[PDB]
């Protein structure tokens, strides 16, 4: 498992996509995962929610005709998710937010 | 089968209104109270079905500077793409 910023950060980098122990909101319902329920580690051993499109619609990062951006949970192991996220770009620039979604930092 | 309801007449801002659904709908007690955190708790963290009753809009998005358009953007997209979510305005 490969769940921290540098570590995330990397790879994306390096492989153009998540590590194999990210899967999307709908990947996990469809295994039982249930928000409410915080049994993601029970239904999916390993896994984080990760690689779902993100709005950016307050315009914080940084916007360009063409680029998306995705998510990805950081620093997450068992029951219900945590406030850390990694923020990556269609072209690669990668920033992570740790009190969610107020503040963000560019590390790539 | 978890409720909701926000008195428009009420709001007085929009961190009003992001405190007012952070009780409302049982968010994390990190809540970012920002459109990105509540896309993130109405698809990864509410319960459901869930029933949204937003009275006096008019009023909110008076003293929340259209900004209560956005939040009900937000609800209405995370329903448009399977949320459980009933929305009522009143």
Do not use: C
Not at chain 1, 20 to 29: F, G, L, M, R
Not at chain 1, 44 to 65: C, V
Not at chain 2, 73 to 79: H, T
């Amino acid at each position: 498992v490969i769940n921290t910023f540098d570590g995330v950060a990397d790879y994306l980098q390096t492989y153009h996509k998540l590590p194999d122990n990210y899967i999307t909101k709908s990947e996990a319902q469809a295994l039982g995962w249930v928000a409410s329920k915080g049994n993601l580690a029970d239904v999916a051993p390993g896994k984080s929610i990760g690689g779902d499109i993100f709005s950016n619609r307050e315009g914080k990062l940084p916007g360009k005709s063409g680029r998306t951006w995705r998510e990805a949970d950081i620093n997450y192991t068992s029951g219900f998710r945590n406030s850390d996220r990694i923020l990556y770009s269609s072209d690669w620039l990668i920033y992570k937010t740790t009190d969610h979604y107020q503040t963000f930092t560019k590390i790539r | 089968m978890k409720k909701a309801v926000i008195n428009g007449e009420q709001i007085r801002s929009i961190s009003d209104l992001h405190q007012t659904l952070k009780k409302e709908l049982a968010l994390p007690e990190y809540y970012g109270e920002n459109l990105a955190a509540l896309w993130d708790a109405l698809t990864g963290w509410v319960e459901y079905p869930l029933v949204l009753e937003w009275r006096q809009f008019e009023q909110s998005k008076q003293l929340t500077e259209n900004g209560a358009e956005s939040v009900l953007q937000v609800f209405r997209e995370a329903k448009a793409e399977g949320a459980d979510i009933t929305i009522i305005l009143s």
